[PDB]
Design a protein around this ligand. Structure first.
Ligand SMILES: Nc1ncnc2c1ncn2[C@@H]1O[C@H](COP(=O)(O)OP(=O)(O)OC[C@H]2O[C@H](O)[C@H](O)[C@@H]2O)[C@@H](O)[C@H]1O
Length: 169
């Protein structure tokens, strides 16, 4: 197994680590095999993690995503696809958490995190915890209870990070 340069992560469990950092800056520094995007089913990378990752690729992520959708159609809620990581990572795993704010079942967050188990090591965000409206601590707990591979979580928001790391899992 390869060794990556992830540094400054707090250990949560045997396989889950967390840091107060911007996922774009972590990806630029570490250049991991897999960075995870918190996507929507259309791969329209507007804001949050998706918009920030896409901007850092100079829109190449969006161009590639548009071809993916034209060929294959939307992803499923809880689903994923593997695309290029462009200048940020070898690959980007686009994963769709439920849009809880629009009535999608929060239970699909477990299905979303199951996609991570197909990859030995990932740099990832907390799925559904932003504009999709899932409680962030719930997303973290589902991640810890679902993902068995090595996941390095980048939490942009300082106040959120401080709360998450002093919560039970
Ligand atoms: N640069 C960042 N680095 C790390 N974490 C971040 C960053 N930006 C936001 N977060 C945190 O990452 C977490 C997830 O926030 P979100 O990115 O909204 O993802 P979702 O799954 O809820 O919504 C998906 C939609 O978001 C996009 O618009 C897509 O195109 C989709 O339409 C929150 O805790 C954020 O504070």
């Amino acid at each position: 197994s390869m060794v990556n340069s992830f540094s400054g992560y707090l250990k949560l469990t045997d396989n889950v680590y967390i840091k107060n950092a911007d996922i774009v800056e972590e990806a630029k520094k570490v250049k991991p095999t897999v960075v995870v995007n918190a996507a929507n089913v259309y791969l329209k990378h507007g804001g949050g993690v998706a918009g920030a990752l896409n901007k850092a690729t100079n829109n190449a992520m969006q161009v590639e995503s548009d071809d993916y959708i034209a060929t294959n159609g939307p992803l499923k809620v809880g689903g994923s696809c593997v695309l290029s990581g462009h200048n940020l990572a070898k690959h980007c795993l686009h994963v769709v958490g439920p849009n809880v704010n629009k009535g999608e079942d929060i239970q699909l967050l477990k299905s979303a995190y199951e996609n991570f188990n197909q990859h030995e090591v990932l740099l990832a965000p907390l799925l559904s915890a932003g504009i999709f409206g899932a409680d962030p601590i719930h997303s973290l707990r589902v991640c810890v209870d679902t993902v068995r591979t090595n996941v390095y979580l980048a939490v942009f928001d300082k106040n959120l990070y401080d709360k998450l790391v002093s919560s039970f899992l």
